[PDB]
């Protein structure tokens, strides 16, 4: 299966488990190059990371060069390597002035338009402690925590909705939707497997679009599959 249906695995492998590269109050070394700014010395692995953090315009890279930015992100292995030298997509935020306690994101989870139990009390209750927020890591805490309740991707624990799927699960099938105060509405396939390759499918997380974490709402849409 992973030779012939690669992108099924990388995007169970993107989201089932919770290991974002995280860090605080941080900035960039040196000037920006073009679109992208570079991030020394981040605990990973077997030592450390220097990460690349593209966005989509020059402009985004200028604008946040030279501050202090909370960094949350997927990362990939760029583009040869080495292991120490780690890739990924978007994921900035400014941080003076952005950090609050633990906000609880309001989330609704629908099978067919039925609405299912979700748990605000726990620890990965999809929540941040940002003011201002990206998209990708509210996606990121989402995407985990439908996995660990109810096994969107396949091989976990939660067996009530079967495993008919392509994803070998319940479903292969359902959009996530970032519903911000402005009406602008935020939708992406919680099934698309892109170009079969992880980077192809974290460069949507590119435009670094953000959103205050008390002016949106998250709709999670799953389509059972039948057959
Ligand atoms: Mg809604």
């Given at each position: 299966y992973?030779?012939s ?7 169970r492998?993107?989201?089932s488990t919770?290991?974002?590269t995280?860090?605080?109050?941080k900035?960039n070394?040196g ?6 700014l ?16 593209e ?17 949350f992100?997927?990362?990939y292995?760029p583009?040869?390597?080495?292991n ?9 935020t ?7 306690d ?9 099978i067919d338009?039925?609405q299912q ?15 201002e ?13 439908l996995?660990?309740?109810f ?9 009530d ?20 105060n ?13 170009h ?9 997380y ?18 059972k599959?039948?057959k």
């Amino acid at each position: 299966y992973e030779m012939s249906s690669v992108g099924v695995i990388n995007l169970r492998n993107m989201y089932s488990t919770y290991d974002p590269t995280e860090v605080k109050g941080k900035i960039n070394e040196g000037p920006p190059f073009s679109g992208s700014l570079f991030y020394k010395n981040i605990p990973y692995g077997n030592s450390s990371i220097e990460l690349k953090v593209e966005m989509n315009s020059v402009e985004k890279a200028n604008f946040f060069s030279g501050k202090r930015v909370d960094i949350f992100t997927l990362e990939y292995s760029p583009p040869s390597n080495s292991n120490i030298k780690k890739n990924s997509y978007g994921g900035i935020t400014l941080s003076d002035g952005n950090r609050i306690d633990k906000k609880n994101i309001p989330v609704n989870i629908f099978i067919d338009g039925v609405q299912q139990k979700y748990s605000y009390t726990d620890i990965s209750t999809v929540s941040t402690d940002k003011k201002e927020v990206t998209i990708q890591e509210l996606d990121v805490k989402s995407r985990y925590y439908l996995q660990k309740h109810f096994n969107i991707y396949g091989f976990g624990d939660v067996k009530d909705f079967g495993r008919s799927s392509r994803f070998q699960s319940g479903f292969e099938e359902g959009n996530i939707i970032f519903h911000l105060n402005s009406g602008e509405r935020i939708s992406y396939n919680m099934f698309d497997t892109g170009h079969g390759d992880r980077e192809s499918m974290l460069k949507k997380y590119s435009d670094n679009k953000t959103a205050y974490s008390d002016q949106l709402h998250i709709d999670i849409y799953l389509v059972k599959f039948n057959k």
